[PDB]
Scaffold this active site. Structure first.
Site, mmCIF file in Angstrom:
data_model
loop_
_atom_site.group_PDB
_atom_site.id
_atom_site.type_symbol
_atom_site.label_atom_id
_atom_site.label_comp_id
_atom_site.label_asym_id
_atom_site.label_seq_id
_atom_site.Cartn_x
_atom_site.Cartn_y
_atom_site.Cartn_z
ATOM 1 N N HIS A 61 -6.344 13.645 47.274
ATOM 2 C CA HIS A 61 -7.678 14.084 47.643
ATOM 3 C C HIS A 61 -7.885 14.343 49.153
ATOM 4 C CE1 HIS A 61 -10.694 15.041 44.741
ATOM 5 N NE2 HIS A 61 -9.706 14.697 43.902
ATOM 6 N N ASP A 127 -18.049 7.585 45.838
ATOM 7 C CA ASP A 127 -18.881 8.442 44.972
ATOM 8 C C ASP A 127 -18.014 8.992 43.840
ATOM 9 O OD1 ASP A 127 -21.042 8.278 46.844
ATOM 10 O OD2 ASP A 127 -20.411 10.105 47.892
ATOM 11 N N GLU A 242 -28.215 6.076 49.157
ATOM 12 C CA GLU A 242 -27.618 7.283 49.701
ATOM 13 C C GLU A 242 -28.748 8.258 50.039
ATOM 14 O OE1 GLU A 242 -22.982 7.291 48.076
ATOM 15 O OE2 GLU A 242 -24.150 9.153 48.129
HETATM 16 C C1 LIG Z 1 -11.506 14.665 46.929
HETATM 17 C C2 LIG Z 1 -12.592 13.645 47.143
HETATM 18 C C3 LIG Z 1 -12.417 12.643 48.097
HETATM 19 C C4 LIG Z 1 -13.376 11.648 48.285
HETATM 20 C C5 LIG Z 1 -14.521 11.631 47.469
HETATM 21 C C6 LIG Z 1 -14.699 12.643 46.524
HETATM 22 C C7 LIG Z 1 -13.766 13.661 46.365
HETATM 23 C C8 LIG Z 1 -14.070 14.797 45.427
HETATM 24 N N1 LIG Z 1 -15.516 10.674 47.611
HETATM 25 C C9 LIG Z 1 -15.361 9.764 48.545
HETATM 26 C C10 LIG Z 1 -16.419 8.811 48.751
HETATM 27 O O1 LIG Z 1 -17.493 8.800 48.182
HETATM 28 N N2 LIG Z 1 -16.151 7.862 49.719
HETATM 29 C C11 LIG Z 1 -14.991 7.755 50.438
HETATM 30 O O2 LIG Z 1 -14.858 6.777 51.172
HETATM 31 N N3 LIG Z 1 -14.010 8.686 50.287
HETATM 32 C C12 LIG Z 1 -14.204 9.669 49.409
HETATM 33 N N4 LIG Z 1 -13.254 10.646 49.285
HETATM 34 C C13 LIG Z 1 -12.121 10.678 50.229
HETATM 35 C C14 LIG Z 1 -10.950 9.781 49.842
HETATM 36 O O3 LIG Z 1 -11.274 8.411 50.094
HETATM 37 C C15 LIG Z 1 -9.682 10.166 50.608
HETATM 38 O O4 LIG Z 1 -9.291 11.480 50.207
HETATM 39 C C16 LIG Z 1 -8.469 9.237 50.518
HETATM 40 O O5 LIG Z 1 -7.335 9.879 51.099
HETATM 41 C C17 LIG Z 1 -8.174 8.712 49.125
HETATM 42 O O6 LIG Z 1 -7.785 9.763 48.214
HETATM 43 P P1 LIG Z 1 -6.293 9.616 47.492
HETATM 44 O O7 LIG Z 1 -6.203 8.415 46.642
HETATM 45 O O8 LIG Z 1 -6.036 10.877 46.696
HETATM 46 O O9 LIG Z 1 -5.175 9.509 48.622
HETATM 47 P P2 LIG Z 1 -4.268 10.618 49.325
HETATM 48 O O10 LIG Z 1 -5.159 11.732 49.732
HETATM 49 O O11 LIG Z 1 -3.141 11.048 48.368
HETATM 50 O O12 LIG Z 1 -3.646 9.786 50.550
HETATM 51 C C18 LIG Z 1 -4.472 9.575 51.725
HETATM 52 C C19 LIG Z 1 -3.676 8.956 52.849
HETATM 53 O O13 LIG Z 1 -3.299 7.604 52.492
HETATM 54 C C20 LIG Z 1 -1.897 7.515 52.314
HETATM 55 N N5 LIG Z 1 -1.645 6.720 51.114
HETATM 56 C C21 LIG Z 1 -1.841 7.076 49.804
HETATM 57 N N6 LIG Z 1 -1.626 6.104 48.950
HETATM 58 C C22 LIG Z 1 -1.243 5.040 49.753
HETATM 59 C C23 LIG Z 1 -0.837 3.721 49.457
HETATM 60 N N7 LIG Z 1 -0.682 3.249 48.217
HETATM 61 N N8 LIG Z 1 -0.534 2.910 50.499
HETATM 62 C C24 LIG Z 1 -0.627 3.392 51.743
HETATM 63 N N9 LIG Z 1 -0.979 4.617 52.141
HETATM 64 C C25 LIG Z 1 -1.268 5.402 51.089
HETATM 65 C C26 LIG Z 1 -1.361 8.950 52.293
HETATM 66 O O14 LIG Z 1 0.000 9.064 52.703
HETATM 67 C C27 LIG Z 1 -2.368 9.652 53.215
HETATM 68 O O15 LIG Z 1 -2.081 9.431 54.594
HETATM 69 N N1 LIG Z 2 -23.352 13.549 44.980
HETATM 70 C C1 LIG Z 2 -22.128 13.331 45.435
HETATM 71 O O1 LIG Z 2 -21.809 12.270 45.991
HETATM 72 C C2 LIG Z 2 -21.118 14.420 45.237
HETATM 73 C C3 LIG Z 2 -21.452 15.493 44.408
HETATM 74 C C4 LIG Z 2 -20.587 16.559 44.241
HETATM 75 C C5 LIG Z 2 -19.374 16.568 44.909
HETATM 76 O O2 LIG Z 2 -18.610 17.733 44.919
HETATM 77 C C6 LIG Z 2 -17.604 17.846 44.058
HETATM 78 F F1 LIG Z 2 -18.081 17.951 42.820
HETATM 79 F F2 LIG Z 2 -16.896 18.939 44.343
HETATM 80 F F3 LIG Z 2 -16.768 16.810 44.076
HETATM 81 C C7 LIG Z 2 -19.005 15.508 45.727
HETATM 82 C C8 LIG Z 2 -19.869 14.425 45.909
HETATM 83 N N2 LIG Z 2 -19.533 13.354 46.780
HETATM 84 C C9 LIG Z 2 -18.406 13.242 47.549
HETATM 85 O O3 LIG Z 2 -17.423 13.982 47.438
HETATM 86 N N3 LIG Z 2 -18.508 12.238 48.478
HETATM 87 C C10 LIG Z 2 -17.656 12.018 49.596
HETATM 88 C C11 LIG Z 2 -16.510 12.776 49.849
HETATM 89 C C12 LIG Z 2 -15.733 12.466 50.952
HETATM 90 CL CL1 LIG Z 2 -14.300 13.415 51.264
HETATM 91 C C13 LIG Z 2 -16.058 11.431 51.815
HETATM 92 C C14 LIG Z 2 -17.203 10.701 51.537
HETATM 93 CL CL2 LIG Z 2 -17.658 9.397 52.600
HETATM 94 C C15 LIG Z 2 -18.010 10.977 50.447
#
Ligand SMILES: *Cc1cc2c(cc1C)nc1c(=O)[nH]c(=O)nc-1n2C[C@H](O)[C@H](O)[C@H](O)COP(=O)(O)OP(=O)(O)OC[C@H]1O[C@@H](n2cnc3c(N)ncnc32)[C@H](O)[C@@H]1O
Ligand SMILES: NC(=O)c1ccc(OC(F)(F)F)cc1NC(=O)Nc1cc(Cl)cc(Cl)c1
Length: 461
Positions: A61, A127, A242
């Site tokens: 992500h 979220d 929020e």
């Molecule tokens: C795509 C997205 C992201 C997202 C979100 C909603 C969506 C649609 N809502 C979030 C939210 O409400 N609040 C929040 O704090 N973050 C939110 N995000 C962002 C998300 O936290 C980040 O994208 C994060 O990177 C976690 O996503 P993911 O699990 O897919 O991890 P990654 O992108 O592949 O890796 C991110 C970094 O961390 C390192 N990594 C990955 N796994 C590990 C482990 N097990 N141990 C150590 N490091 C790790 C990767 O190498 C990279 O640097």
């Molecule tokens: N209401 C929401 O909360 C939300 C709705 C739609 C959405 O769009 C998508 F449908 F395309 F997913 C994403 C949402 N919310 C987040 O993606 N939150 C978030 C993401 C990052 Cl990278 C960092 C942090 Cl802090 C929050």
């Protein structure tokens, strides 16, 4: 135990992320069965002559190649059914429950597991639940509960970490605390999380989910700030706080306050009164309260429902130039004039603009997470997606993001990027500040001297 893959679908997946911009390809994808396999692969990278890049991938992500390992190996931490999962445990010493989870486990799967084993659940969320535990713990993990419970990095007792030397280490506040607090918010720089011991609470059964509209930003922020100060010596409070910025079509902009009140069979009788009492103390526009009553799981999974609707319109696999800022509360008013009305005034495919305050004292200052130097700060999330197959849409969104960063720089707003996308050494030095940069570099020297891990973050070389 584990297997190296050169399957083109595996390589293509490991070479991309949700951002849809960074595309650095690895040599192979590693599918581990257990922690020792990860230790083995990292050990080989550490011992190798060239010192190839190793990065763990959660659910991919990342916005800007943070999980990509250029010409190296991507560890597909997604195991899932085949492996045994630890059951939640109660501790009389901690005064509560915990659960041991694999670093690659998705929060949605964690939730389903703990609910079906004692009706327990983590207290602090994101979220979106289709994120890995290791991935969010490497950042912070925030949503509407963070004001009260702190981020997800404040709700973890212990970890198993595979360092950049391929050593498996159990760490906590009492055992190897430098590695534990270093890894938390550490951007994958000091090791791969193979186990996380997540704090749990007795899960609520249902949610009273409320939205209320504001045209006045001063009243909206004042109400958000008052809501996050509630919950001192008991007291009536919402369980989630929020907010989001709305365009008037379909003042010039409106602000939506979003709150929830969690309840079960015992509290079902007082939920209507608690909600009416808290709402009466607020200054939202009369006749703009929207209410929903739904199961706890359904509320927590709401963004996955938005995702399924986007996938049905071919609007999910598009570039996501998402920008996340932590803004000191003292500078939030100027932020509205200049950004919400200024830069954004007059959205590609569209997308939310989130805004809500948090309490710094719920964030442990020993962790690697970077927050502004103020007790109250806001997350400002620009979650606007580019139009499908339209590269100019991504370019226009990218220029808007640079205008927002320039606005913060030009007016001296001490904002900090969450999921920092910095790439220059001077940008990272400025992000951390002298004291934190010094702690960060020293932790790197100790746990990843060859800078093998999470090189896609672009901090060390
Ligand atoms: C795509 C997205 C992201 C997202 C979100 C909603 C969506 C649609 N809502 C979030 C939210 O409400 N609040 C929040 O704090 N973050 C939110 N995000 C962002 C998300 O936290 C980040 O994208 C994060 O990177 C976690 O996503 P993911 O699990 O897919 O991890 P990654 O992108 O592949 O890796 C991110 C970094 O961390 C390192 N990594 C990955 N796994 C590990 C482990 N097990 N141990 C150590 N490091 C790790 C990767 O190498 C990279 O640097
Ligand atoms: N209401 C929401 O909360 C939300 C709705 C739609 C959405 O769009 C998508 F449908 F395309 F997913 C994403 C949402 N919310 C987040 O993606 N939150 C978030 C993401 C990052 Cl990278 C960092 C942090 Cl802090 C929050």
């Amino acid at each position: 135990g584990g297997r190296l893959s050169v399957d083109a679908s595996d390589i293509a997946e490991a070479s991309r992320d949700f951002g849809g911009v960074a595309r650095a390809e690895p040599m192979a994808v590693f599918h581990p069965r257990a922690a020792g396999d990860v230790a083995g692969l990292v050990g080989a990278a550490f011992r190798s002559a060239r010192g190839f890049r190793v990065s763990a991938r959660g659910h991919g992500h990342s916005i800007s190649g943070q999980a990509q390992a250029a010409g190296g190996v991507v560890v597909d931490m997604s195991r899932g059914a085949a492996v045994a999962r630890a059951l939640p445990v109660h501790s009389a010493a901690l005064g509560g429950h915990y659960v041991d989870v694999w670093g690659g486990e998705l929060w949605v799967d964690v939730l389903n597991w703990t609910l079906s084993h004692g009706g327990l659940a983590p207290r602090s969320w994101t979220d979106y639940l289709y994120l890995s535990v290791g991935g969010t713990l490497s950042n912070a993990g925030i949503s509407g509960q963070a004001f009260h419970h702190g981020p997800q990095i404040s709700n973890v007792y212990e970890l198993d970490v595979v360092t950049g030397k391929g050593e498996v280490v159990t760490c906590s506040e009492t055992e190897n605390p430098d590695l534990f607090f270093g890894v938390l918010g550490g951007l994958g720089q000091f090791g791969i999380i193979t186990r996380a011991r997540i704090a749990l609470e007795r899960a609520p059964k249902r949610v009273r989910w409320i939205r209320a509209l504001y045209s006045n930003f001063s009243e909206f922020t004042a109400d958000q700030e008052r809501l996050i100060s509630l919950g001192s010596g008991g007291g009536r409070r919402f369980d989630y706080v929020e907010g989001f910025v709305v365009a008037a079509e379909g003042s010039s902009v409106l602000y939506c306050l979003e709150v929830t009140k969690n309840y079960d069979d015992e509290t079902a009788g007082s939920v209507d009164q608690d909600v009416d009492t808290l709402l009466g103390e607020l200054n939202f526009l009369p006749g703009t309260v929207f209410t929903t009553d739904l199961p706890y799981v359904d509320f927590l999974d709401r963004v996955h429902k938005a995702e399924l609707k986007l996938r049905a319109k071919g609007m999910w696999e598009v570039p996501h130039p998402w920008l996340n800022l932590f803004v000191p509360a003292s500078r939030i008013a100027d932020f509205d004039r200049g950004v919400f009305r200024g830069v954004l005034g007059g959205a590609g495919a569209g997308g939310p603009v989130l805004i809500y305050p948090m309490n710094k004292h719920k964030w442990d200052p020993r962790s690697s997470a970077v927050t502004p130097d103020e007790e109250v700060f806001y997350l400002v999330a620009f979650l606007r997606s580019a139009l499908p197959g339209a590269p100019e849409s991504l370019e226009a969104l990218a220029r808007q993001n640079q205008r927002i960063l320039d606005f913060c720089a030009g007016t001296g707003i001490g904002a900090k990027q969450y999921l920092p996308g910095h790439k220059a050494r001077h940008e990272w030095a400025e992000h951390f500040g002298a004291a934190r940069w010094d702690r960060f570099a020293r932790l790197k020297a100790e746990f990843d001297p060859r800078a093998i891990l999470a090189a896609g973050q672009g901090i060390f070389r």
